[PDB]
Design a protein around this ligand. Structure first.
Ligand code: NA
Ligand code: ZN
Lengths: 256, 121
């Protein structure tokens, strides 16, 4: 049903992104995200998941939430948009896995109404980690990835949705390039769409430079100049195709 | 999960632990959203982290690769592992410097030995 071909996403910019990437300017933040998502959409929509005519599936922004200032929290409590990092304050960044969980927990209400939710931040996660996401799946009862399917958090005492992921544009005290940032998000949304990492050894899906380089689902971000960098491997295609063919009817909407 | 490689001399000092342990033991999976994994390894020559956690035995990682979980192998070859100490445990991730001691080139092991510098402090 090439009608429901768009995964609408809730894009969230925390206060660090606003200040550090948007330089405290709303329009700058907004334009950076819209343009990034449009370039990610360009890759998706032109991808034929079956090497045939099964294309035109993409991502579009349903809403942008820009948190201009840090979230105020009563002592003892945490929030993904709070001034301090967690669990170790002294550091510039949160523990990456812990931040995604916190974001999922706090955005629950809003994430429940969209195909995907994505957090954009600006913090130097350890060992050069740029982002992460919950992997999607065609399994009728899949919790992570595309389409909200409530997961009950025992400690949270409420329903949270794992239709999320996050991108940071900061790394080793420096701002990454747009070309690199676009590929980080493509890759994280990629897990959301059901893809796993492109494997080596098999390397049909992880070509060497002299062949066009790695495809977007390779785990090492590195550059973005080689041709394959902006394309999904055959491994990701198979994987994503099943997920889409199963979940599109459940939460995808009409384009534009 | 996406990582940006960088310098190994920088990674060396940034990590709490740096060992050349083996995975002769095995891997154990746990419950949760997606899950956690815990590898049992026999340490050998520690190059860093004598203070923090002198001699490690259990290395923890996320079970899901998309969440930066680490993928090793049972009763196989040796690995040059790095990781961090948190709440009395060692956690390693896909973004952490990790390499099969086999693949480790003569050039690299030479730079590894340049631990004498201990730069860090
Ligand atoms: Na970083
Ligand atoms: Zn990944």
């Amino acid at each position: 049903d090439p009608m429901k071909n768009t995964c609408k996403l809730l894009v969230v910019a925390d206060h660090r992104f606003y200040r550090y990437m948007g330089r405290g300017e709303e329009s700058t933040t907004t334009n950076y995200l819209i343009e990034l998502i449009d370039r990610v959409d360009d890759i998706y929509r032109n991808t034929a998941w079956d090497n045939a005519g099964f294309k035109g599936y993409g991502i579009q922004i349903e809403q942008i939430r820009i948190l201009k200032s840090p979230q105020e929290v009563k002592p003892g409590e945490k929030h993904y948009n709070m001034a301090k990092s967690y669990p170790n304050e002294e550091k510039d960044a949160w523990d990456v896995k812990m931040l995604l969980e916190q974001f999922s927990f706090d955005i629950a209400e809003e994430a429940s109404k969209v195909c995907l939710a994505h957090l954009f931040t600006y913090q130097d996660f350890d060992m050069g980690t740029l982002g992460l996401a919950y992997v999607g799946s065609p399994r009728a009862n899949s919790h992570g990835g595309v389409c909200p399917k409530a997961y009950y958090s025992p400690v949270g005492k409420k329903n949270i949705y794992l239709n999320s992921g996050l991108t940071s544009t900061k790394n080793y005290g420096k701002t990454i390039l747009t070309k690199e940032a676009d590929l980080v998000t493509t890759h994280e949304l990629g897990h959301n769409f059901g893809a796993e990492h492109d494997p080596d050894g098999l390397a049909e899906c992880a070509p060497n430079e002299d062949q066009g380089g790695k495809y977007v689902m390779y785990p090492i971000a590195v550059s973005g100049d080689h041709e394959n960098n902006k394309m999904f491997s055959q491994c990701s295609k198979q994987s994503i195709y099943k997920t889409i063919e199963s979940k599109a009817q459940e939460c995808f909407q009409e384009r534009s | 999960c996406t990582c940006s490689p960088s310098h190994p001399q920088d990674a060396f000092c940034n990590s709490d632990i740096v060992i050349r342990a083996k995975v002769v033991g095995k891997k154990l999976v746990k419950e949760g959203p997606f899950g956690t994994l815990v590898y049992t390894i026999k340490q050998m020559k520690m190059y860093r982290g004598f203070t923090k956690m002198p001699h490690v035995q259990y290395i923890h990682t996320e079970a899901s690769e998309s969440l930066c979980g680490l993928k090793l192998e049972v009763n196989k070859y040796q690995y040059l592992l790095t990781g961090r100490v948190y709440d009395g445990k060692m956690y390693t991730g896909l973004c952490n410097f990790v390499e099969r001691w086999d693949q480790l080139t003569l050039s690299q092991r030479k730079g590894l030995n340049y631990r004498y510098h201990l730069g860090c402090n």
